[PDB]
Amino acid sequence: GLGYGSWEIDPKDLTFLKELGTGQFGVVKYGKWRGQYDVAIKMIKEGSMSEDEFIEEAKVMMNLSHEKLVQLYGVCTKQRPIFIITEYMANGCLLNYLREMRHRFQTQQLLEMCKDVCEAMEYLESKQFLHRDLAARNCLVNDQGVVKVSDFGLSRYVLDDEYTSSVGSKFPVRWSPPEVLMYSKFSSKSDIWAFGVLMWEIYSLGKMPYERFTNSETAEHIAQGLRLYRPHLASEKVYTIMYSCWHEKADERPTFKILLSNILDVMDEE
């Protein structure tokens, strides 16, 4: 109502029910909006984000909507800490989900997770919207087991320099192509590279990429033209798809539309 833009939620409409996590960028809670609608609420740690820039971008993000993309419902901007209100994903972070061996996943389930992410990324690519930090840690799983992409574009607003360039301890070296590591060349094709690493994470049940190497060793490995190798659960055709994302020449990597077609082919064949 009065006093709130279309991107703004009145925090008085929130009922906080459970804490989900705490970390460097804040606390995340599960709650309800207007008593009925499940939401996740991220409380942004003071000093961690370029908040005015994020708020302007939130207005853009409100217009992104796809069934495999975590939905932004709004932001609470009038007080501190500010809140980001989104779709609630009851089964939590994809990385944690993959690592729970009890699930005893079939490879068909793993391929479906890859397809969910690929559909979201094809949508983002169609909107010329780069994710910039695609990885299993940035995906979520709902109570039906559907994977959705989260945190899209958020890295642009992080103030901590450990996160923000290639040298930093928190930069996603293991999800980055050579041109990012060598000269900070971000593009659609750096999201493609990261997607291949994400497929590897899925088929490896959440292992760390290049688990025996440091970040510095990883950068050297990949810049020498060497790669991850085939997870045991990936068929030859699945491995071909993820490996295609890692061409040294960015322009020789597929688009998300092509990847989606290839994933659907494998689903039909296997």
Ligand X SMILES: O=C(c1ccc(Oc2ccccc2)cc1Cl)c1c[nH]c2ncnc(N[C@@H]3CC[C@@H](CO)OC3)c12
Bind-site residues for dasatinib: 86-89
Give 120's contacts (C-beta < 8 A, 6+ positions apart).
Answer: 66, 68, 69, 148, 149
Q: How many CB atoms lie within 10 A of CB 238?
A: 24
Give 1's contacts (C-beta < 8 A, 6+ positions apart).
Answer: 10
Element (H, E) at 169: none
| Minimum distance of ligand X from residue 8's CB (angstroms) | 15
Bind-site residues for clofedanol: 86-89, 154
| Minimum distance of ligand X from residue 96's CB (angstroms) | 5
Residue type, 70: V
Sign, CA torsion 151/157/160/161: positive
Residues within the interface to ligand X (CB under 6 A): 20-21, 28, 40-42, 61, 70, 72, 84, 86-89, 92-93, 96, 140, 150-152, 154
> Given the structure tokens 């993000």, which residue do they identify?
61
Cβ proximity to ligand X, 39 vs 241, nearer residue:
39
| Minimum distance of ligand X from residue 239's CB (angstroms) | 28
Cβ proximity to ligand X, 14 vs 70, nearer residue:
70
Element (H, E) at 234: none
The answer to whether the beta carbons of residues 34 and 54 sit under 8 Å apart is no
The four Cα atoms 231, 212, 189, 161 give a dihedral, to 10 degrees, of 150
| Minimum distance of ligand X from residue 112's CB (angstroms) | 19
Q: Quick check: is 52 catalytic?
A: no
Bind-site residues for ATP: 20-28, 42
The answer to whether the beta carbons of residues 198 and 134 sit under 8 Å apart is yes
Cβ proximity to ligand X, 139 vs 222, nearer residue:
139
| Minimum distance of ligand X from residue 204's CB (angstroms) | 18
Q: Distance (Å, rounded) from C-alpha 162 to C-alpha 21?
A: 21
Q: Distance (Å, rounded) from C-alpha 164 to C-alpha 158?
A: 7
Cβ proximity to ligand X, 32 vs 221, nearer residue:
32
Cβ proximity to ligand X, 33 vs 246, nearer residue:
33
- Catalytic choice (10, 13, 38, 133): 133
Q: Catalytic residue numbers?
A: 133
